[PDB]
Amino acid sequence: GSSGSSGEKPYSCPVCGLRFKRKDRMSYHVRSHDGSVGKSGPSSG
């Protein structure tokens, strides 16, 4: 797949196929696909 733009829409959801205008909104959607999490355990103290 080739977009074809020197530089437009720096924030998009190519994972599923859905462009976005907001950077904070796309981060909540695009993330919905690539799920990852596993903070460290409770350290002493």
Ligand SMILES: [Zn+2]
């Ligand atoms: Zn998406």
